[PDB]
Amino acid sequence: SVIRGLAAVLRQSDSDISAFLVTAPRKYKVYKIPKRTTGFRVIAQPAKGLKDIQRAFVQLYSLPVHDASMAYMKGKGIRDNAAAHAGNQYLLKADLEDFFNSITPAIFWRCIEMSSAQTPQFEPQDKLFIEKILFWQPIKRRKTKLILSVGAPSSPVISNFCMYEFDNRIHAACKKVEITYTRYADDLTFSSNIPDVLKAVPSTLEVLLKDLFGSALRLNHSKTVFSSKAHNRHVTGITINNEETLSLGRDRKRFIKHLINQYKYGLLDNEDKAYLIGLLAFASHIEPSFITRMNEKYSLELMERLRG
Amino acid sequence: TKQYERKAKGGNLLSAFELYQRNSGEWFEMCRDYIQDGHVDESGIFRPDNAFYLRRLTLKDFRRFSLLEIKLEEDLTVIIGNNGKGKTSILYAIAKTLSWFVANILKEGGSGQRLSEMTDIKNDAEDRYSDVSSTFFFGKGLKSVPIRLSRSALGTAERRDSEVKPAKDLADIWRVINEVNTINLPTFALYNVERSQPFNRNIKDNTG
Amino acid sequence: NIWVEMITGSDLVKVTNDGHDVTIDQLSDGQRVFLSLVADLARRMVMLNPLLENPLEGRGIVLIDEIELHLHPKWQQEVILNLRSAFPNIQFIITTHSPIVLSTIEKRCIREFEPNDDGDQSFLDSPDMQTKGSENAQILEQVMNVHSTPPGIAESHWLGNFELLLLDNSGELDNHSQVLYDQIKAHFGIDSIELKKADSLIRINKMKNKLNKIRAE
Amino acid sequence: RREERFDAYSQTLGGAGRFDHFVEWYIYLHKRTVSDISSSIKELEQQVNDLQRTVDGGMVSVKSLLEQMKFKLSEAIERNDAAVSSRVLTESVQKSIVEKAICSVVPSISNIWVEMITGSDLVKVTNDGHDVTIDQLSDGQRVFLSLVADLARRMVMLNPLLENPLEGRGIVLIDEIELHLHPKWQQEVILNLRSAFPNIQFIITTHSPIVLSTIEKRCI
Amino acid sequence: SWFVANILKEGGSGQRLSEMTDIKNDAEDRYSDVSSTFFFGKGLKSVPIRLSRSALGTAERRDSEVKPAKDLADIWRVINEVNTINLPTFALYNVERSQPFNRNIKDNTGRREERFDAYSQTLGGAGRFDHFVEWYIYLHKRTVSDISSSIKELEQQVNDLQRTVDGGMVSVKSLLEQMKFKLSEAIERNDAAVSSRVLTESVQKSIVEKAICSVVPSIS
RNA sequence: UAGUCGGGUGAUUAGCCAGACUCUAACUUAUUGAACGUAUU
Numbered sequence A: 001s002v003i004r005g006l007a008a009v010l011r012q013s014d015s016d017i018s019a020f021l022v023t024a025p026r027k028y029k030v031y032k033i034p035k036r037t038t039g040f041r042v043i044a045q046p047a048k049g050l051k052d053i054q055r056a057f058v059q060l061y062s063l064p065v066h067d068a069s070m071a072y073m074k075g076k077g078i079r080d081n082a083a084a085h086a087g088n089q090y091l092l093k094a095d096l097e098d099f100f101n102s103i104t105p106a107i108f109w110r111c112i113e114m115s116s117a118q119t120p121q122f123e124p125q126d127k128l129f130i131e132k133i134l135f136w137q138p139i140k141r142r143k144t145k146l147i148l149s150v151g152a153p154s155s156p157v158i159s160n161f162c163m164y165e166f167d168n169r170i171h172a173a174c175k176k177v178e179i180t181y182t183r184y185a186d187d188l189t190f191s192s193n194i195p196d197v198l199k200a201v202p203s204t205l206e207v208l209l210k211d212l213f214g215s216a217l218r219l220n221h222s223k224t225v226f227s228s229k230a231h232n233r234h235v236t237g238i239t240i241n242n243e244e245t246l247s248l249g250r251d252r253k254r255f256i257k258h259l260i261n262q263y264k265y266g267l268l269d270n271e272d273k274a275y276l277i278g279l280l281a282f283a284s285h286i287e288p289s290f291i292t293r294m295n296e297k298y299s300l301e302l303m304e305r306l307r308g
Numbered sequence B: 001t002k003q004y005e006r007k008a009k010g011g012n013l014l015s016a017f018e019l020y021q022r023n024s025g026e027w028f029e030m031c032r033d034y035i036q037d038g039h040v041d042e043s044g045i046f047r048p049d050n051a052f053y054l055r056r057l058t059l060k061d062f063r064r065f066s067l068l069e070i071k072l073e074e075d076l077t078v079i080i081g082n083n084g085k086g087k088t089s090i091l092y093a094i095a096k097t098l099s100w101f102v103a104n105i106l107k108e109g110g111s112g113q114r115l116s117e118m119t120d121i122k123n124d125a126e127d128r129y130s131d132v133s134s135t136f137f138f139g140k141g142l143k144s145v146p147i148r149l150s151r152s153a154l155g156t157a158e159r160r161d162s163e164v165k166p167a168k169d170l171a172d173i174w175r176v177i178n179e180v181n182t183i184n185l186p187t188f189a190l191y192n193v194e195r196s197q198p199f200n201r202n203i204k205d206n207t208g
Numbered sequence C: 001n002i003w004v005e006m007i008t009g010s011d012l013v014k015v016t017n018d019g020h021d022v023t024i025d026q027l028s029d030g031q032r033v034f035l036s037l038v039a040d041l042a043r044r045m046v047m048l049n050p051l052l053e054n055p056l057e058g059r060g061i062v063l064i065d066e067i068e069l070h071l072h073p074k075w076q077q078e079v080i081l082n083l084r085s086a087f088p089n090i091q092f093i094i095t096t097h098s099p100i101v102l103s104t105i106e107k108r109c110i111r112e113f114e115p116n117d118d119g120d121q122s123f124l125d126s127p128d129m130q131t132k133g134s135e136n137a138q139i140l141e142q143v144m145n146v147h148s149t150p151p152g153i154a155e156s157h158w159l160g161n162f163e164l165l166l167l168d169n170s171g172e173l174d175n176h177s178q179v180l181y182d183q184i185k186a187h188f189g190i191d192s193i194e195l196k197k198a199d200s201l202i203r204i205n206k207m208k209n210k211l212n213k214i215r216a217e
Numbered sequence D: 001r002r003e004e005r006f007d008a009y010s011q012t013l014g015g016a017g018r019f020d021h022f023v024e025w026y027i028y029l030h031k032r033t034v035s036d037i038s039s040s041i042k043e044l045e046q047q048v049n050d051l052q053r054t055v056d057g058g059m060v061s062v063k064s065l066l067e068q069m070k071f072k073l074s075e076a077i078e079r080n081d082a083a084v085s086s087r088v089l090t091e092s093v094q095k096s097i098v099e100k101a102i103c104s105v106v107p108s109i110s111n112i113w114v115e116m117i118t119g120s121d122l123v124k125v126t127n128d129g130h131d132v133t134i135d136q137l138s139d140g141q142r143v144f145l146s147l148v149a150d151l152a153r154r155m156v157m158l159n160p161l162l163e164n165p166l167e168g169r170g171i172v173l174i175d176e177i178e179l180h181l182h183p184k185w186q187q188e189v190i191l192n193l194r195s196a197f198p199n200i201q202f203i204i205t206t207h208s209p210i211v212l213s214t215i216e217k218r219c220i
Numbered sequence E: 001s002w003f004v005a006n007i008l009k010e011g012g013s014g015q016r017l018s019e020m021t022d023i024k025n026d027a028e029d030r031y032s033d034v035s036s037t038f039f040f041g042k043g044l045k046s047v048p049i050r051l052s053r054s055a056l057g058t059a060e061r062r063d064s065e066v067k068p069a070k071d072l073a074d075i076w077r078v079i080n081e082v083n084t085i086n087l088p089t090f091a092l093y094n095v096e097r098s099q100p101f102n103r104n105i106k107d108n109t110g111r112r113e114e115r116f117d118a119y120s121q122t123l124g125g126a127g128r129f130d131h132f133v134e135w136y137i138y139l140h141k142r143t144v145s146d147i148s149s150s151i152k153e154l155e156q157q158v159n160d161l162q163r164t165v166d167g168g169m170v171s172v173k174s175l176l177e178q179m180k181f182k183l184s185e186a187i188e189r190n191d192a193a194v195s196s197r198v199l200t201e202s203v204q205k206s207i208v209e210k211a212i213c214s215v216v217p218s219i220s
Numbered sequence F: 001u002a003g004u005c006g007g008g009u010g011a012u013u014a015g016c017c018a019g020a021c022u023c024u025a026a027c028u029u030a031u032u033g034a035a036c037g038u039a040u041u
Ligand SMILES: Nc1ncnc2c1ncn2[C@@H]1O[C@H](COP(=O)(O)OP(=O)(O)O)[C@@H](O)[C@H]1O
Pocket: B062, B063, B064, B081, B082, B083, B084, B085, B086, B087, B088, B089, B090, B119, B120, B121, B122, B123, B124, D127, D128, D130, D132, D136, D137, D138, D139
């Protein structure tokens, strides 16, 4: 049935879809992306044919996603995520270990079985094809190790779904004690105005993770961080200032001003100019007031010339 | 790259060092000044502009500890408790972590020490592995250097990996910069109760 | 002072210890162990900090377990101050059982285990009491949870019991209180702190009773 | 060598004790308590009798084996007789005495026993309510355990005729009694030692005012 | 040393260069290299090996390159495991070989009979003439003895013991099982010896005697 | 006191100025994929 649906969407024969899927878990290109300090991240991207199938699958089958999930959501993003916590004085951030690569077919099917909200029902015959669509085989010789790859177009949807029940439970628990909760992919954020309630959240998380996923998904204990208005507070790379407003942060703003000053004296190369323009668009989205101030500081004419 | 150049010009040490390694003057001097720059305070004491200290330590299923977190002072931290509270365990854990800096200052890709599979995992831990997580600070250009030492219990099928690359990356900066032009180097030392020993003047170490 | 002599035909390190010239082998274990620590540390700092005017102002992390090991109480009162003065940029992480050591250290530097922990405490914290410049007896009780007197000795309870007896008999020295008073006097002596405290209790209770009688009339 | 009575004098005045000798001796005691020597003699006697019957029945090939078994039997009887001749406390009683002494004097230790783990004998302790190996003990606990265990072993070996061998005579020297002890232990240590070893002359050195608070000025 | 280690054990390590003694004192590059090239027929004309060591604190590590030697040694090891082959001899005889003879010769545990005892201490500089004497006496005893006579004797003893157990003496069942195990072990050792395609002890003796007498002029 | 937030200045990722904050307590991260902002069509 899954095959027939995909074939219809992609205007291909059932036979050619089925044939392609036999070795689909191996049809991934692996490459490295530089980290911002030292080192690299290793990324696996599906081949074009497989990407098309994955996108078709996600189109055909709607999986439930909790409202606290902010990543990969139509019409939402990092601004909305940060804004959810801007009014609270105390902040807790937690992180999940090897989030995407921890999600296996076993976890996926367990989530389907456990799901409260109306999941699509799959025929047992289709289960094998679905696994081949959604999961990557990193080790050639070990056919038994299938995992989600962050580089796949279906992985965001599947990961959000797998966290649906988790999000339900923790959201409900937090609401009872006046804690705001949001999740951006593997990044969990908790905020409150009540002192000495966020301390219990990490223990609650560990229990819930064990209950739902056993040992498959775990907290990164080194990445559990408490903050308050006494210290720097950021959420997904957006600074929350002490006036409870979203900000780019002082250092980033000063850097932008530096680039504008360089542009004013024709010192910016084309690459840096392009860079500046892109940054200003983002700045306009997070902190429109900053753009107003730059217009005031630098002549509207200069800024228009830059953005033209 | 332009991204590294921006970060390096912003005062990031790791980016400056990466640029030095690819182009192998400007970047070398940035790295060397980061390590060497300092000032003499009112009391006549030299103070480095970029201080180096252990910020935080986390212990998971290590010896008696299920999950413990410690925040350390930049200057002096004193740990007190009854016998058997784990005061020595804490210093052991730190020393093993510091061994990774020492090993990599001495030799590229050197090996530091390990948690014992025989003794270091908590006896009643349901998950049969232990983690010692440390975060080090080295000035505002390198605010966080995270290290994790891990070990699974003897005979467990799933082995838990240590994460030591950040220690190696920092120790590499010290080693490489020193080779080109001498710099001052950090001292790491552990003095446990084994320091009490009978003296022998006649016994010489003929090794190094 | 410390110096090397070669004249005998073997190389000998000598020290002036309490005004006497001795060999390192002649030092007490306490002196030798502490000398060893400082000597070792200084050597390493000198070797690793060739560009500093004072190489002992270099950076590093030093861990010392049981800092009070083999030290007389007199030395325990100096040791942390001396180390921090000599090595001003080292991060020291220390363990101790000594209230005398703690009396020289700020409470912010102290991390205390909870008394009935059993190894599920999430975070270590400072003591509530300020330790730096505090009396030893207070540190013992407030920070180290140890009574000022040994609980397993009967005589340790006599002054407490004496006070209770005074309070039970409306402040008058009865036959029972007198017996215990005499026992305290006999055991601790005529000029003992314990007896003086007993005397003080008698005097204050007599005065309180006189007030009470005046008020009743 | 560790089961010989005068091993109690081995390295007695060397300063460290021999805690390794204690462990060996204690495991030995445990193995002997799990296996009786007379049953082995009875079993060996039965084997010798069975082998003698086979030799009497014309099987001359087993004569060499009979002679070996007779030797083993004679040795077992001699050991039994020597044990009998030494007029010694039973191995079970010896074990119990030492265990009680350790648990009474060492505050963190409530129990000590020998486990067969894998294929090698291990001494385990209940320390602060948790079962641990000796190698898991803190330095303070281990050092103090070592002192008491060693002393108890030697007293048991040297005082076989006493109902309580720890009530024997002797002179024990201890340098820096407070070594590695928290103040709470320092308040108990002299009391515990004197209670366990009532007839020993103790000559000790200390830097601890907490220790001195438990002692009469005449002793100082 | 790298060939010997890898013939004996998969992933065996040979000897490293010393950082203290092997590096030239005034080397600008602050590292040392020992590069060797071996030949093994026209199929393997070049087997390069490099031992390397850098000084402490150098910006780059200099590691040894030993894989080709290991690969070759692995061929010898693996092929030999399946079907016995002849193996290369490596030996070093330093001035140390001039040492006095310890006459009092040690009890044959039976390590000396093992084929890969031939690699024991082979590059230590002295040889092991003590091992020779033990092995040579061992060879003599085996030559004077019959082969499988112990097995035949053990077979006879197991048969006699089996008859006793069949006759109703259940007490000797434990001894029978032990003796059956000893017999099986003896057969296995004999079979392993048979499987190891080794020369008879008499022939081995003769070869060595002839060699010694031929090479050493004063010895007939 | 220290750390943090950051309105202004400043050929400007620095420095300087002003104002404020303090649950034991931020460490600024990752693409070609996904989402969002901008540009184009
Ligand atoms: N693997 C382990 N599992 C459980 N408890 C352990 C383990 N290792 C050590 N312990 C316990 O930890 C304590 C050791 O304390 P230690 O680290 O020496 O600190 P301190 O010097 O304060 O006594 C003892 O209570 C010992 O029983």
